[PDB]
Write a protein that binds this DNA or RNA. Structure first.
Length: 33
DNA sequence: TGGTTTTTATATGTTTTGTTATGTATTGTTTATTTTCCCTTGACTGACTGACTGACTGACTGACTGACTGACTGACTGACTGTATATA
């Protein structure tokens, strides 16, 4: 029923992440080398 | 435990509105010069109206005039009173 007011389909979205490394150890002691 | 949905970050697209610099044309600024009729300056012109010359008829003193009024005085008529006259 809805209509998008303007289309982007030839987009090529890149599979790249927004979570930095700062948020996959969660502590100073929690980090490997 | 385990699969699914909802929101968000990044990335891009869309549209409206407002900012700044500029080159060309119009018009203003200053200064010098000539013409136009409005506004001062003034004698001429025409009616005006103050002092001087005429004048005109009502007011108070000159009392006047003349009839009338007021005191005096004699004339006269009525009331008072004596001389007189008559009778017992």
């Amino acid at each position: 029923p809805v209509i998008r007011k303007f289309t982007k389909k030839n987009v090529a979205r890149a599979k790249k992440k927004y979570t930095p490394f700062s948020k996959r150890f969660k502590s100073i002691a929690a980090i490997p080398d």
